[PDB]
Amino acid sequence: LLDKKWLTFVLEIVTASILWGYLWKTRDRNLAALTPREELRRNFTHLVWLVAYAWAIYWGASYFTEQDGTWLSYPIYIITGFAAFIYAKTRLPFFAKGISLPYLVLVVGPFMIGFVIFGWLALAVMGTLTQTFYSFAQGGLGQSLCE
Amino acid sequence: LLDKKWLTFVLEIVTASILWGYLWKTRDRNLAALTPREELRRNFTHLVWLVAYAWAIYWGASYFTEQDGTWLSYPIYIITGFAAFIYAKTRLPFFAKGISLPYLVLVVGPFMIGFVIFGWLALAVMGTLTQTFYSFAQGGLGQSLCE
Amino acid sequence: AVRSHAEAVQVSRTIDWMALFVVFFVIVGSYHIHAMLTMGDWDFWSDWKDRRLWVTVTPIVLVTFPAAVQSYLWERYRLPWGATVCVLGLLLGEWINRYFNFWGWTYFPINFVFPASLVPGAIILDTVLMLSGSYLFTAIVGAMGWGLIFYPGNWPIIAPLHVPVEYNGMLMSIADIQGYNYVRTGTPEYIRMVEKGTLRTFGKDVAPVSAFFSAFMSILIYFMWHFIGRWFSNERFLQST
Amino acid sequence: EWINRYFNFWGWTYFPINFVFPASLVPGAIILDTVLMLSGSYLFTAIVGAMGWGLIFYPGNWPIIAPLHVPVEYNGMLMSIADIQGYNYVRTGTPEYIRMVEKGTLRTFGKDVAPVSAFFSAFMSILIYFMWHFIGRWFSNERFLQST
Amino acid sequence: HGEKSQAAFMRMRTIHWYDLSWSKEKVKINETVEIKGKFHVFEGWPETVDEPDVAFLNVGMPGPVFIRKESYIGGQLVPRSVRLEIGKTYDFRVVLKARRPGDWHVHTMMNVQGGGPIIGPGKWITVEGSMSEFRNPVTTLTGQTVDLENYNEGNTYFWHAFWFAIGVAWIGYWSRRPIFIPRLLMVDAGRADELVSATDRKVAMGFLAATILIVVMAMSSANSKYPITIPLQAGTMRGMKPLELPAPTVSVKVEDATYRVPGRAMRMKLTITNHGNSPIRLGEFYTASVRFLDSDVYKDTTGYPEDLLAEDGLSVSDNSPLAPGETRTVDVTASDAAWEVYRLSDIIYDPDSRFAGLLFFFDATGNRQVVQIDAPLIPSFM
Amino acid sequence: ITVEGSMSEFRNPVTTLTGQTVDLENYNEGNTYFWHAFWFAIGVAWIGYWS
Amino acid sequence: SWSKEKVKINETVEIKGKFHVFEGWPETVDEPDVAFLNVGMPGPVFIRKESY
């Protein structure tokens, strides 16, 4: 099984309330008692949220910002980014017991989006990505890689 | 002997090619097997290159930049600086196994010479000079100095 | 290694002379670039040597390198002549170029293209740096001395050029007449950022106000460039360029 | 750039593609990356590859914009094909005077508008590359704050 | 020689100099050369160059080979920045005194606030003699006659050498002892507290006190000697008189204009309208420091430079006298090697293919009338 | 102002000083596509080679 | 012309006259493209009821 086909798959304020609330209430309190096999299955779903976040940033900051240049998406990617943040912090190890600085910057910058200075804050995706790779390389590092 | 009278003593692109090439190919691979007496003899020649570099910076950035103010040298001091860099890195110990930050800044700034910001990079000569003094004070520190 | 004590001292003296040469000439080149690309217009011409813009700008942009070179030389060798060597190098470059290019190729008179004098400011800066060696007291008092004594330092030179003259029915200074006579193709009169009057000046306060503003901004520039020179004085060895 | 030109500039409005075509930067990117890898030193990259990026930008787009620079006599006054396109296809929000373009200067000598601009762009691109390398290095940190 | 290097269109339509007259061609040292003429600030002043709200009438020579003794625009002295009005015509007069022997230019040029130099046509002037004979006396309001060639030079040398000597004395005082390596080692290996000690502190207090006292005493002496001083005089002069030219009776409207690429000719079509009661003939076309003249109607006698003079370079297809009230369309061709020598053919490389110039119309009586034309310039290739 | 017809019938010819008549509706469009697609293909080829 | 020399509270004082902007306006002072006709007193001892 592992990764499933989630990859293929007023209102804005309301949607953020349940999605953050449902995700935060459903946090796993017993994070230590977590097998590495289910970690990798759970660790993909965090990457799916990041992929959904990149899609939302692309659909918001590319197709719609210059759309006014020829002349909704901002709250959509705000919700997606904060949901990915909450998912990482709660479900994943190596993201709990502390707030990741690049992950927080990536979530907040585009959220708070003069926008030139703020659009650079999406470069924190590099630190986010290296942190996610470190999260992947916890139990599933080997044996194969580096061999 | 020690220091000799070297102190008294298209084309620009070509001259840099041989001078860097001849100096880099003639690097001493067995740097460890180097007596302190020959070090000091070799360590003066590096200072001669720095003196030739100061002369070239002075002849380029003083007599010729303001010459246009009343209204070649830049490549000359570029070649001299990079040649001094290669000489230090290859022949000298305490300059190998790593690129000196102030020495690199001093070589590059005037090379890349809006020029106000770049002309400050020649202040790295202070770090260069203290590093050269440390290189001198390796085997020939005493006994005499500090006594 | 080394043979004996005496010849070791001779080697130390030779290295001292060579290092003084290299540091002096590099400082001359870099600080001459900085002066001519930040300040040079005023220093060129006597009629440009006014009392508002000249007095304000020149110390502010010429405390830069002396601050850094003091921050290095004093902290690393207890040598209290960084500002003096910077100023002497600038003056040497200025004067050789005036005599060999301004008066040599062109024929601008020396009394017209004479450079400014900064040795009093450099001497005050260095002596304040050494006596009570604290860099903050230097940046507070010696920088004020540098800013304040710049104009009275050059006053014995520019005073004879400020004698009023009736020139073809309109009042002029000797410096103004020199600038009017000896033509400057690239430096016309209107580029002269000089004292052109203001409704917010009260009495004989064009020079003292400019002098004090230069002193305070020179305090600030000294404080900034002390740390800039401190960074430039590092011995870091990069491993991956 | 291209999807928005084709779907919004040419899709909703009808600005022609040959009028609203974007610039080409692949040669500059390729030079930057190859200089970055070969002799992997970041300083040599910022010194030489940045110059390559700045210098090859205009000759990179020259094969595209050269046919638009053919002179035309348009109603008694000289024009380029690009000028005629801008004059014809009206832009409500982008009038002509906003065009920060080459309007002449008494301090230009001969055929030096492009090479001087190219070299200035190359040097300032060296500077911006040097700054943004460290900006990205900071953005690449893995710090874990403990108290937001 | 800065002229020609500038943009062709910018040279053609910035400022037009005409009626230029140089007092002498060959002079000796201390002799005066007088340049007279009128310059007209073009109505179509380019946007990229800031308006001459603050401009200065300069003279372009390779260094002060001539000293600008006097310079008038209108009838008043203009030694400082002046304000020019767009479209007005001014008459200028510059008095130059020979200083350096040799052959030199002059360039009736100028300088504007946001555009820099605007070089006008220049004439070769030969100077004979020796520089040693040159003299530039001036009498101050205090009551003494001084020579600006050597005034204050001695004081400048004395003070600069004195301060340099003080600096060198200080640096030598701290350089007699070993300088770099022993002092660095002593300051690194624990506290030094021995490199700076009495009586070095005492002698440095002496240096500081001597410097301050010397500065104060020198300021006092420079306030005793030369007790009357004034600040440097500056400030743009406004209220500046232009020429009150009579309204032209000739109306010329340009229907297209072409120039061969490559070529040395400029072809344009004109519709001259004649008024008054005199038969006029087009005589001269001044475009950018280049005078295209028709020999059959007008000949230059002002000693204009040969390279900028086209004695027969202006050809008109129908140059018969134009009766008053009658209007006719005629093709005008201005061809000269100067058109390519002074790089007037790089307007194709310039970003604004528009020209401007002056047309000089003469009649049988002899008096002339100036009319201005400005039209887009259309290059032709086939 | 009411306009009737179809966009396909529109034409914007212009004659250059070089001596050819070109249609601004489709002039240089082919060259623009060719060069932009070529450079994008080179970039994609490089990224695929390292991917 | 000042309407009155000595007045009491609530009384009106009227200042009339003509001012001529000099042709030779100094360069160091920006042109009066935007200027305001004020009246100079040590604080509002008089209120500027009207100004024409």
Ligand SMILES: [Cu+2]
């Ligand atoms: Cu010339």
Ligand SMILES: [Cu+2]
């Ligand atoms: Cu005119």
Ligand SMILES: [Cu+2]
């Ligand atoms: Cu008045």
